[PDB]
Design a protein around this ligand. Sequence first.
Ligand SMILES: Nc1ncnc2c1ncn2[C@@H]1O[C@H](COP(=O)(O)OP(=O)(O)O)[C@@H](O)[C@H]1O
Ligand SMILES: [Mg+2]
Lengths: 597, 459, 54, 166, 18
Amino acid sequence: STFGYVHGVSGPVVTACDMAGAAMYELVRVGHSELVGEIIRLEGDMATIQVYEETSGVSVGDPVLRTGKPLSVELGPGIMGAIFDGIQRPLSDISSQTQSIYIPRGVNVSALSRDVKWDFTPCKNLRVGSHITGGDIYGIVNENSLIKHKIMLPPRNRGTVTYIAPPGNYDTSDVVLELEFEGIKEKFSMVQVWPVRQVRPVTEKLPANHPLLTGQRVLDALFPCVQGGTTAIPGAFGCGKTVISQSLSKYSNSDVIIYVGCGERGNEMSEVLRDFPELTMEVDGKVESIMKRTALVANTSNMPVAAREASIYTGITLSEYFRDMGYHVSMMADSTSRWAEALREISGRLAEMPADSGYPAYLGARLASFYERAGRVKCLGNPEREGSVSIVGAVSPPGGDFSDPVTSATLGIVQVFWGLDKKLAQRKHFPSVNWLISYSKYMRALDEYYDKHFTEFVPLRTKAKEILQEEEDLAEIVQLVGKASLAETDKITLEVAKLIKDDFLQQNGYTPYDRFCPFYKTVGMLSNMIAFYDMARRAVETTAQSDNKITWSIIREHMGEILYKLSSMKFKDPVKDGEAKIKADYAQLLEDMQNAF
Amino acid sequence: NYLSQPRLTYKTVSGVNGPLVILDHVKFPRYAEIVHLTLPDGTKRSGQVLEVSGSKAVVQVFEGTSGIDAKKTSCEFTGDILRTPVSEDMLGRVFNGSGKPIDRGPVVLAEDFLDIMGQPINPQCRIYPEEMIQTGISAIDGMNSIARGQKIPIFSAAGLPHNEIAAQICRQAGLVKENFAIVFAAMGVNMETARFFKSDFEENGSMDNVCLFLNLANDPTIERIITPRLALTTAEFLAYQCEKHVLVILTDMSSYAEALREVSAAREEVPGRRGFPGYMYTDLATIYERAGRVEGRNGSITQIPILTMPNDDITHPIPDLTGYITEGQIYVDRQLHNRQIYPPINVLPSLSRLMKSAIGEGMTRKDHADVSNQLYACYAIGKDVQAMKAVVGEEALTSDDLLYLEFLQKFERNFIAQGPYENRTVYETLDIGWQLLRIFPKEMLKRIPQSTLSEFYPR
Amino acid sequence: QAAMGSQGNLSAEVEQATRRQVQGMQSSQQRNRERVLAQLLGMVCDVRPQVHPN
Amino acid sequence: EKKEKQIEQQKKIQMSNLMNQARLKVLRARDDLITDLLNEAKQRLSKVVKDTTRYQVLLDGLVLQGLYQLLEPRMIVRCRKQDFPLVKAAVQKAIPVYKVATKRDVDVQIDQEAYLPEEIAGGVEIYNGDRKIKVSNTLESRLDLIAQQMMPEVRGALFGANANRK
Amino acid sequence: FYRLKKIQEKKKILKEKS
Ligand SMILES: Nc1ncnc2c1ncn2[C@@H]1O[C@H](COP(=O)(O)OP(=O)(O)O)[C@@H](O)[C@H]1O
Ligand SMILES: [Mg+2]
């Protein structure tokens, strides 16, 4: 059979009769406007289809044509600086082809433009007659001044080269390579079609060693992330789950960035494409905007719900595609809780039985099969490069409660957990990461990096996390008993920790100096606030009881100029690099001598 | 272009339970199709087709199934989806919840027929809201400033004056130093609530541009679903197709979702929290994200939806899900209403996400971004100090925290408390805000850098 | 005096602006009445029968 | 300040109530300009019913339009009393074209027990065999459908078009 | 309640065909 007939439509799902030779997760086109849908259940002759567009007006007599292929994306040049929807239709080309402001929900726009010409160059060390396997580079295309889009063979096939294209300008439809493999000759182009629900093949997984530098101080120091790791950001509304997402997409160490808006706001993706073409960064002494390494998968909350599933798998396929070139990809999914609400609404139409709080029983398997596509890993192919995929997925728990079937299922999968607090947002304490409940599991994986470049930082965070918990164990005493009955080794603990929460942990994202903090500034200003805690320890412990001693009341009136130096270490712009390391020690020599006097 | 085939009429109902009527032997039924039911006594009822399966079509009537026969009722299938007649003369009038005139008026002459579900805006051609709306209220304009094209709800409760501050921001809506067409959806309101909004818009002379849609509590609950849908597709017409700045006021949004729970529980759909459906986030976002402004047009649409949280709970499914879609909220509180503050606005759970682009040198002036963060920080510490003097004592606090006591009694009485008709400008608000920061020393204002302290704190 | 000037605000327009808007469109109705009725009556006689497209 | 502020409010309500009745009068005046346009259209369709050659070639397709939209084995034609010999040629002409497009075969009859009322201008109403499904294809039912879809066009072509669009 | 009512709705479906 070639095509089908609608039997019933109820919301997103469509039951289609006369559909016998159809496989699961095939792509179909239901209706006269050809709405893109995917088969999820079939009972003999009738198949059930979730539709990625609005089914409003679909009648029973509508045809459902089958494509014989799953939901896939086109991978090639024309993808950096672009913005797509869940099923990878380019939003910049969909608004010039129609000249409207809406998506006409019928349009089969090609994902990569078949008219724009790219300047292909060969591998230079790939002659005719050379053997070639799946996943090795056979050409270099410079998509921008920053991105060299390395053209690769698909991982399925292999052969012997019979024709390679000379260097010149080519479309995405021009034949570039011919491979004879059995004595069969298959043509190739600069685009390849890969299904989004299939994990990309790769040589072997690798442990992660290099950290991901987000730019925030509480994120880089206390709960560090690696490139190739999995991160989850839960939190209620107004906590700042997009300010962590925007500061990571602007100032991380990652080669390419993708940003998947899954059930997000419409204004928050328009916010991205405004300030990104003006924010330039410096890689080779040249300045180029960060939109040339950015690609957006925009599926807002107004857009249909089944495309939230497709926008997640579209992104992680683009994330794994630039992984294979040797780049260090970082993916931000916002929000993964809206993907979970999509699976609940689809399974409610199929009358499936629910797991805890409405969600289907296969919720934790969908999340596990998405976070496990991340990792630092040696790619397929002969030039022997290495790439990585970092996934930082925002979770939106209902009511700000972390006992949630989406949040608690996520915390069993991810390794880094940045718990955002609402009480830290009710006061203007940004970023709102709750230092008590947050954790990381790359600690043992990163200290082999930390005894090479910053050889003093691991004893620092062991004390800084001890001071912040010592404050919390005494904060319950003050609100019940009172501050006047404390000891002197505890009043120094509460004030140094208050200096840590105000200078080190608080960070204004829109000011010109704290919008990015390099790691020498992070280790630097933490090395002085803990040495000040250790120097004030000896003022209390060594002179303990006998003499009329330093009792910390004389400290806060005599160190009022020195405490003002400690509270102002955050004001060091990137207009100075070497001077900031000196002023970290120039503040320390004031700290060195004042304990003697 | 036009449907010209004659509509079919079926006398073939096969099941009716709850609000759902099940029609059999329908030939090619259509999803989301609108129908017309003719009762055996002659009253006409409309209905949407919510499920079709082969020859069967499950409709739901808007006015309820009370009296629907099995042998004698006749349903007529209008061959298109629910499209409302929208026009430019659909302005200056009062309509009911469904579609009909109220003030002894004609039906609209229908410049075009727009689908009430609309279609989502492409995010590539949706320009970010930048210009600021001066509402005349210091708690709004000073700390949580709204932009033109911003969705921002009023988080209220039962008994609090949310309708009074709704009419206030309508009279005083203006650009920071050609009027706003207000479309008003009244949903599940009392009669005295609808008379308050009618007599306020007929008082300030703005009723030549008011599009008031009223839907009282005696009107059926299934018509509350299509009530914001019709009130936003005229605002979509006036702003994207008629080039005019529109302010949409939705009330009560709690009465929308409680009416949404009744239809979902009757269809036996999967519940989320507290019995509300799982698709409540999507249904709330299909009427919230129809706001903002587009690139090729000079008109815009801003949304201020009023909702009353049940039992003062901000973690209820109503204000939690609307807090995840909108761009910051306004929290009118109850404990500030007992002290006879007329806007009882607790600024600590209030937010405006688009306030940062709407403040600055070109927008109002230099110190707006800095005095708002400092007034927020001194109110946050002084309220935690207020919970300490109630448990320990009024005298044994830190000497700095007695200034925090003196700040809070001057914050809640001079800064936010302004009266029902006083419309301060944004430059008046920052001038009153610096007077309350004057009682603090210069070096305790930590969130303000030393540069702009020199220009404003000695005065 | 204010109640006397307010009655001056009554008949000044309600007979001037309201009545000119009726006869202003009564003339515009009469100029275009026959072209509309020629197009509208033709569409009733343009019957064409397909069956569903299904 | 009670004697002055109340009469300033009551005058401002009175002024705003004047513009309401002025707007509603000119809007109701626009109703009767469309209402008689639909009324004189109802008269001018009756003149099409009077002459026979244009009315029957209308009635051939208008019976077939109800036939192709119902698609039943047995169908029942219900007509006006005067047009009964005219529909009998119209049904008999519409049989061998139904067998051309569709490949079932119809079994029409014409109900002599009940006719359309005399005030009905023209047209036909075609039922199914079980009296349950009905296609109302009269001239009052065909004028109403076209008048709904053309209210955008009979406003802009007949009054002034709005100066503010898109 | 939602799980147990869904079982009873499915139990009438199999009973009606059989
Ligand atoms: N680093 C920061 N500096 C200053 N303000 C911030 C910072 N981070 C967050 N905010 C404030 O928090 C508000 C909410 O940010 P948002 O990302 O929208 O939280 P969420 O996405 O969880 O709803 C923002 O509008 C902003 O005013
Ligand atoms: Mg967000």
